[PDB]
From Swiss-Prot, chains A, B:
Shown stretch of the complete protein: 16 to 57 of 283
Effect of A25V: In CMTX1; localized in the Golgi apparatus without reaching the cell membrane
Result for mutant: M19I: In CMTX1; localized in the Golgi apparatus but also forming rare small junction-like plaques
Compartments in which it is found: Cell membrane; Cell junction, Gap junction
Organism lineage string: Eukaryota, Metazoa, Chordata, Craniata, Vertebrata
Protein name: Gap junction beta-1 protein
Family: Belongs to the connexin family. Beta-type (group I) subfamily.
Domain of life: Eukaryota
Disease (UniProt): Charcot-Marie-Tooth disease, X-linked dominant, 1: A form of Charcot-Marie-Tooth disease, a disorder of the peripheral nervous system, characterized by progressive weakness and atrophy, initially of the peroneal muscles and later of the distal muscles of the arms. Dejerine-Sottas syndrome: A severe degenerating neuropathy of the demyelinating Charcot-Marie-Tooth disease category, with onset by age 2 years. Characterized by motor and sensory neuropathy with very slow nerve conduction velocities, increased cerebrospinal fluid protein concentrations, hypertrophic nerve changes, delayed age of walking as well as areflexia. There are both autosomal dominant and autosomal recessive forms of Dejerine-Sottas syndrome.
Gene name of the record: GJB1
Length: 42, 42
């Protein structure tokens, strides 16, 4: 029922976001807090 | 040749400063820098 601009392009871009997020979830943001250190001793 | 106000009182006060400084030199100020710590990790 959808037109061509959303049937193809929107779905592909959504899959692109899914794949990029999966790649960047465990890898880029895996050590976001463990390696987040501050210069203070508190 | 000195008068009474400096022959007795001034000398005694000077000795008082000597004794107090000797007591407070190694004891009070002995760990002035070794125990001087800062909250930073730098």
């Amino acid at each position: 029922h959808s037109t061509a601009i959303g049937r193809v392009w929107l779905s592909v871009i959504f899959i692109f976001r899914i794949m990029v997020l999966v790649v960047a979830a465990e890898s880029v943001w895996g050590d976001e807090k463990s390696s987040f250190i501050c210069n203070t001793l508190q």
